[PDB]
Amino acid sequence: KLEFMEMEKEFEQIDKSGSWAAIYQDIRHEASDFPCRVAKLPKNKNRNRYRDVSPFDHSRIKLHQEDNDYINASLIKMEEAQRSYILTQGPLPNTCGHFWEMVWEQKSRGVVMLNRVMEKGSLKCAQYWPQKEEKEMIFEDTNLKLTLISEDIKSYYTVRQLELENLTTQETREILHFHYTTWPDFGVPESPASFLNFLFKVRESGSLSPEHGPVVVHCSAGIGRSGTFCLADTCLLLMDKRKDPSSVDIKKVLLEMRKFRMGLIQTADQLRFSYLAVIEGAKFIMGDS
Ligand SMILES: CO[C@@H](CC(C)C)c1ccc2cc(-c3ccc(C[C@@](Cc4ccc(C(F)(F)P(=O)(O)O)cc4)(c4ccccc4)n4nnc5ccccc54)cc3)cc(P(=O)(O)O)c2n1
Ligand SMILES: [Mg+2]
């Protein structure tokens, strides 16, 4: 059905009336507000990249360690969509160990990186993975070893094969790393097409399947780009899982998601983009082949 003719014209209307800001601002001020007591404890000050961005206590990921179970990371659970994602900040020099420990304990098979290690002449993220096959990384603190196995570098993104080894249990797992390299902070992807392509690549890898732990998604703060990516994915599912795709209220879904982590999607443009990506993507996924 050409029911998308409405979604598209509706989108055109919002674009015509330039009401994206208002829509976006309305969502910010209606979003859930939950405690982040743990995040704010003095002993965890150095585990947070930013002062005002914190995981809610109720959905924070806990490290299975008696010393300190804290990591700035959130479990987002979407009921209807039937998908889970873990959103976290770009690892810090002192939290790379914690980061891979989380991947191991939560049984994640994939990691989606939407920022770059060097952003705007200031490294806004630590190099938490090996760049050379021969220079594997060892995290003494968590007793994990990580090795680059292969990497397919493309124009708008790179896909890597990594091997994570728990030195305690001596087990080894293959972790897929999906890096989107052209998404500036407080910005949008090169285009919906490149974005969706990257998204589909992640989907077909099986990294988002229920048989594994949730995929770990991160950018710099773990809320703008990460939130846009997850919102797009989740809404694509709902449109393909519901009788009437036009019944998918992205505003509503973002609010649902904002119950698990604060500030998901940081600019009105990112909201518009997620919208455009969901529409373009649904037409494809619903279109003939
Ligand atoms: C949960 O409930 C509420 C509650 C209270 C009012 C009680 C609540 C509680 C806390 C909140 C905090 C921020 C909220 C607070 C701060 C910021 C900007 C940021 C971090 C940040 C970086 C990159 C990205 C990104 F978008 F690029 P990425 O793609 O990487 O994610 C997102 C966020 C910062 C901006 C620019 C450079 C350096 C740091 N920063 N962090 N600390 C700072 C201290 C001084 C100056 C700037 C600071 C954004 C949202 C925003 C909101 P809001 O959007 O809901 O209004 C909040 N709401
Ligand atoms: Mg080499």
DSSP 261: B
Q: Which residues are annotated as a binding site for substrate?
A: 185, 219-225, 266
Closest CA to 199 of 170, 220, 223, 225: 225
Cα 96 to averaged position of ligand 1 atoms, centre (Å): 22
Is 262 near ligand 1, meaning CB less than 6 Å away? yes
| Binding-site sequence positions | 185, 219-225, 266
H helices within the chain, ranges in order?
4-16, 20-28, 96-105, 192-204, 224-241, 250-257, 268-286
**Closest ligand 1 atom to Cα of 183:** 29
- Architecture of the structural domain at 1-289: Alpha-Beta Complex (3.90)
Is 77:149 a contact under the CB 8 Å cutoff? Answer: no
Find out whether the beta carbon of 50 lies less than 6 Å from any atom of ligand 1. Answer: yes
Please state, in angstroms and rounded to a whole number, the distance separating the CA atoms of residues 108 and 128.
16
DSSP H helical segments within 205-249, as ranges? 224-241
PDB experimental method? X-ray
Q: What does the domain layout of the chain look like in residue ranges?
A: 1-289
HSE-CB at 120 with a 13 A cutoff on CA atoms is: 8
Q: Which atom of ligand 1 is nearest to the CA of 222?
A: 31
d(CA 66, CA 124): 29
What whole-number distance in Å separates Cα of residue 16 and Cα of residue 10? 9
What are the residues whose beta carbons fall under 8 Å from the beta carbon of 282, sequence distance 6 or more? Answer: 4, 236, 239, 240, 245
222 lines ligand 1 (CB under 6 A): yes
Q: Which among 250, 201, 196, 186 has a CA at the least distance from the CA of 27? A: 250
CA distance 145 to 88: 21
Instruction: Please give the Cα distance from 190 to 211 (Å, whole number).
Output: 32
| Residues near 11 by beta carbon (within 8 Å), at least 6 away in sequence | 275, 276, 279
Q: In terms of Cα–Cα distance, which of 227, 187, 258, 223 is closest to 52?
A: 223
**What are phi and psi for residue 133, nearest 5 degrees?**
-55, -40
Interacting residues of 37 by C-beta distance below 8 A, sequence separation 6+? 57
Start-to-end CA span in the chain (Å): 16
